[PDB]
Design a protein around this ligand. Structure first.
Ligand code: CLR
Ligand code: CLR
Ligand code: CHT
Ligand code: CHT
Lengths: 333, 333
């Protein structure tokens, strides 16, 4: 159902470009005058054992056994995704690289002597770049999900998905990163005022919670766009309804996946960091291991969230019949 | 589509009854040892004029003209409902009566010398009785809505709907009044602590807002149950989706209906209270007029909320075709 590429949002692409031009004008105006990645596959067996031992020793928890089984099954499929797409795990370094290049440009142009372009620019463009990662991962994962066999592009993560983002759907990302910018900046202003006084803790924490809610929603909205190739509002509303109807499954996947994945990166970098010391003192190895383990499991979580929404859409439409077959793997629930 | 009466929820009916028995045990254990109702019809013409004059003298508001037209049309139909059901306006006095009888029992049994049954009892049972009013009104209004002609029970509000609540759906109300009880009591505890200190204003106000959100949702869930005759969770989820998809219409109906209906009761009791004084001092007439005008327009608002959800369901299903006709009145939008 993926063979429809309709660009979906143009006004917000134009606003993003026009802003970037205005920022460039101000710039020029003042100038001219030992890895943990092993977990990406094996963590699918560790997670099932972890649950198995935790529930030994109370039994009211059994009503959730159906919801945890889904969470575990999704991790198994996520392992298959990274096996099929060897380049996917490395994708965060191109995002980091791009962020650095922008940040160096930003800080260098701030030195030349309107100012609101640099304050808004820094935040909006950085969120834009990060939101582009979310669309890019969802594209590659969706392509895998809806392929019924082993035939694909040899290097799908760099041969596909990014081409669709830049050619068609770049406007959809622009709108989403703008919406979150309108929240991230007010929160920073309140934090500044608070420290200069000090009773703003409640309103600052509320906006912080809002940021997480909007981010999660945007990530699902981007995936829904990649599948249905519609505009932002339609994708966000469709994904929202699915998240509400399956809210019990979303809460389980996010609470259990977070606990398990947290132990994943923490336990493996503790083991790696203490290995080979033999009573010799540096901790630079421990910091390295933390940073790479975090970026590897961060994108791992993204793949699981995309697979969940793909499953839900694969049951809202395309039900079973002699002429209709599911795109899902053998995950029956 | 209303000919299906399936009881919908039994476990929460049993829990409600078992609690009431436990409360009765504790009781016995310690013992044995000039009206404003004219508005119910004419307010449908006053509302349209009020909007007409307010928009004379800015024009950005015109984008909402489609949403206000719906709000006005719903008020017109609400007038028809009260004309067809003359007994409906008087219904709040039986709710008040029932609340008094319980409250007298409660306070009398508190005097005999476990205590948690009286604290939880007072709140849960009172919300139960009030929630029963919400189901009762929705039943009568839904019956009118889905009747295509003038044939009905002569005294439908007392001949129907209450029979369905007591015979089938009493368990559905029990669950809803329990959920709101779990919020109303913590809020009261925080208010108590605050006055004995004083920095709890934020968390108290948040719970208060939550109470209004849950109440509104429950009222729509009860109406959805009356139509679809399903269980609470299914009705609440279905009504929730409709409220989100039409959120722009809900915000308009609640913000404009509240402003107009507020003026309705306030203006008419001011006029009645100052009438016939002729320089004669009592204000007991003004208080009487306020109290009756409030209960009359409170149930008026309930009828409008039920009609809105009925309209939405009448367009989600039962679309136009040679074999399908809408149940709605001539409200085309
Ligand atoms: C309008 C003109 C002047 C500027 C256009 C800039 C475009 C081409 C830039 C801005 C943001 C960039 C994206 C930001 C982040 C990533 C993640 C990375 O892992 C792969 C490349 C990818 C997906 C980039 C591709 C190129 C991109 C879309
Ligand atoms: C279990 C046994 C002993 C007691 C059962 C008591 C039941 C029948 C009582 C308790 C609360 C009552 C409801 C409380 C309030 C109202 C509002 C009124 O406008 C119509 C009747 C209605 C909807 C009542 C119907 C009867 C009711 C459901
Ligand atoms: C970070 N999670 C995705 C696990 C939860 C967001 O609410
Ligand atoms: C009281 N209203 C129904 C008007 C609004 C509730 O949020």
């Amino acid at each position: 159902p993926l063979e429809d590429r309709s660009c979906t949002d143009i006004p917000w692409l134009l606003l993003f470009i026009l802003f970037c031009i205005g920022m460039g004008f101000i710039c020029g105006f003042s100038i001219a005058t030992v890895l943990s990645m092993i977990l990406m596959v094996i963590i699918r067996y560790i997670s099932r054992v972890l649950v198995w031992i935790l529930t030994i020793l109370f039994l009211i928890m059994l009503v959730m056994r159906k919801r945890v089984a889904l969470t575990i099954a999704l991790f198994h499929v996520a392992g298959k995704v990274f096996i099929h797409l060897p380049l996917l795990v490395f994708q965060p370094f191109w995002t980091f690289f791009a962020l650095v290049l922008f940040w160096v440009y930003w800080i260098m142009t701030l030195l030349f002597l309107m100012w609101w372009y640099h304050v808004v620019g820094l935040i909006w463009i950085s969120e834009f770049i990060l939101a582009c990662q979310q669309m890019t991962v969802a594209g590659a994962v969706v392509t895998y999900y809806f392929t019924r066999d082993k035939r694909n592009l040899p290097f799908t993560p760099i041969l596909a998905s990014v081409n669709r983002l830049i050619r068609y759907h770049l406007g959809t990302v622009a709108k989403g990163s703008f919406i979150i910018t309108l929240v991230k900046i007010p929160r920073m202003i309140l934090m500044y005022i608070h420290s200069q006084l000090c009773v703003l803790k409640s309103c600052i924490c509320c906006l912080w919670c809002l940021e997480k809610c909007l981010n999660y929603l945007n990530q699902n909205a981007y995936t829904a766009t990649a599948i249905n190739s519609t505009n932002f509002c339609t994708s966000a509303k469709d994904a929202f309804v699915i998240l509400v109807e399956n809210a019990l499954r979303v809460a389980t996947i996010n609470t259990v996946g977070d606990f398990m994945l947290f132990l994943g990166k923490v336990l493996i970098v503790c083991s790696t960091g203490l290995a080979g010391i033999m009573l010799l003192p540096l901790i630079i190895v421990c910091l390295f291991a933390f940073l790479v383990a975090h970026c590897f499991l961060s994108i791992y979580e993204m793949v699981v969230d995309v697979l969940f929404l793909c499953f839900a859409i694969d049951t809202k439409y395309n039900d079973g019949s002699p002429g209709r077959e599911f795109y899902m793997d053998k995950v029956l629930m």
